[PDB]
Amino acid sequence: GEAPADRLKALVDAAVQPVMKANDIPGLAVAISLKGEPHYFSYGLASKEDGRRVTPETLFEIGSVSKTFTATLAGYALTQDKMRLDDRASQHWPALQGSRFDGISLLDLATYTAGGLPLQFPDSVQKDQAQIRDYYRQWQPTYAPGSQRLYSNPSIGLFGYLAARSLGQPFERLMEQQVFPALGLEQTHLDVPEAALAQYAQGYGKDDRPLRVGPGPLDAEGYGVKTSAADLLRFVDANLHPERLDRPWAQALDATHRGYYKVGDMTQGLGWEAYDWPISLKRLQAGNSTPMALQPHRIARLPAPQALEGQRLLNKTGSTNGFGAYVAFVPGRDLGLVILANRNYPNAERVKIAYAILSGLEQ
Ligand SMILES: *[B]([O])([O])C1=[C][C]=[C][C]=[C]1
Ligand SMILES: [Cl-]
């Protein structure tokens, strides 16, 4: 019958439409993986000025969802024995020898516990190798490495940069030429080709100022991916079924499904952040709140890394000045969701859409 497809469209429309109106989101793409099948729902405008509609092939900036791609490259380096999580950061970049990175692990960098690396590089650090080098050489922890989580682009950015160094190649080249092809992603870019530019949505900020992300230090590692809802769902499906990939890449994905500590209801992996499932909407919002993102939190370290599988929801938010993304999946239910928008609208609202959909797929 037409009942199941009708029900799914009604569910997704009911979740998305009010949130788009309430947050003045010009365009939004949803992709859902359910029972081994993909479903796409596209809303609104990729560009208001030229009237181009969003489709499942529209490219959006995913911001910090890129950190899960970075984590996957690191997982490849780890499981190929090029680095270990307990390595000191300065073991992988001679410029860092003699700095405080002699006493900071790769795990600390990956999971934001290096001791207070800030949310963003300061504005004094441009996209320039020497400036980035000098920034890390001079940086000193505010508190002991391993003790407090402070969500940070320079932290996990350095993790990605060092993973690339451990592999002997630039980060951007490894992602383009090795990671994206291994994952079957042909509509996923760090640097959008001219031939794909017509698919790149406009981002919108205050007064509908147009915002596509400009260059910044460790942008590729931290926030550089532009992808479609369909390709990002392919990446979620790879995460749901790592065993379907060639074994080196299966292991790389599995490395991103291991939790190291808890803060509140959240268990922190490499890139992915996990919750028990079911959990209340308010708690999932709180785990993705502004205080969680902006304030230091003492961690509760696990005695052994925990498998992020089964009755859990793995997620990641991502933002740029013009865009707001959210991805979530439930390993033990073979359920995946991507929500890509061309306004940076609050995480609470992204989670509201997702929760309504995921809860309605449960019921
Ligand atoms: B991410 O979208 O959460 C992000 C964090 C810091 C700097 C850039 C991106
Ligand atoms: Cl930054």
64 given a catalytic annotation: yes
Question: Counting atoms of ligand 1 from 1, which one is nearest the CA of 325?
Answer: 2
- In the three-class reduction of DSSP (H, G, I as helix; E, B as strand; rest coil), residue 145 is classed as coil
CA 278 to chain CA mean position, Å: 22
Q: Which of 64, 121, 347 should be mutated for ligand 1, with most atoms under 8 A from CB?
A: 64
Question: How far, in Å, CA of 331 to CA of 69, rounded?
Answer: 18
Considering the candidates 64, 66, 99, 152, report the single residue annotated as catalytic. Answer: 64
Backbone angles phi, psi at 187, to 5 degrees: -120, 35
Going by alpha carbons, the residue nearest to atom 3 of ligand 1 is 64
- 181 cis-preceded (ω within 30 degrees of 0): no
List, as one string, the DSSP characters of 23-50. TT-SEEEEEEEETTEEEEEEEEEEETTT
- For 200, the 3-state DSSP assignment is strand
Closest residue CA from atom 6 of ligand 1: 153
Instruction: Looking at the CA of 122, name the nearest ligand.
Output: 2
Q: Which of 38, 32, 65, 54 is nearest to 360 (CA)?
A: 32
Q: Which atom of ligand 1 lies nearest, measured to the CA of 293?
A: 3
State in Å: Cα 223 to ligand 1 middle: 6
C-alpha 154 to ligand 1 mean position (Å):
10
Question: How far is the CA of 289 from the CAs of 68, 176, 293, in angstroms?
Answer: 19, 32, 6
Ligand 1 atom 1: the closest Cα is on which residue?
Answer: 64
Please calculate the CA angle 184-189-192 and round it to the nearest 5 degrees: 135
| Total of domains in the chain | 1
Residue 343 near residue 294, CB atoms below 8 Å: no
State the distance from the centre of ligand 2 to the C-alpha of 219, rounded, in angstroms: 7
Interval between CA 141 and ligand 1 midpoint (Å): 20
Q: How open is the CA angle 204-63-28, to the nearest 5 degrees?
A: 50
Closest ligand to 70 CA? Answer: 1
Please give the method by which this entry was determined: X-ray
| Count of CB atoms situated within 10 Å of the CB of 33 | 21
Q: Is the Cα dihedral 275, 276, 278, 280 positive or negative? A: negative
Range of the domain at 314: 1-363
Here the CATH number for the domain that contains residue 342 is 3.40.710.10
If DSSP codes are grouped into helix, strand and coil, which group holds residue 66?
Answer: helix
Q: Which of 43, 76, 135, 151 is catalytic?
A: 151
DSSP designation for 272: -
Give the separation between CA 156 and CA 60, rounded to whole angstroms. 22
- Strand ranges for the chain from DSSP E: 27-34, 37-47, 52-53, 60-61, 148-149, 188-189, 226-227, 258-263, 266-268, 273-276, 297-298, 300-307, 312-319, 324-330, 335-341
Q: Which residues of 40-59 are buried (b: 16+ CB within 10 A; e: fewer)?
A: bbbbbbbbeeeebebebbbb
The tokens describing 81, both together, are 């024995």
Query: Which is nearest to 287 in space by CA: 305, 274, 278?
Result: 274
* CB-defined site of ligand 1, < 6 Å: 63-64, 119-120, 153, 222-223, 318-319
The phi and psi torsions of 189 (rounded to 5 degrees) equal -140, 145
151 given a catalytic annotation: yes
Residue closest via CA to ligand 1's atom 4 equals 64
Ligand nearest to the CA of 157: 2
Cα of 345 from ligand 2 centre, angstroms: 19
**For residue 95, which amino acid is it?**
A
Structure tokens at 117: 């690396």
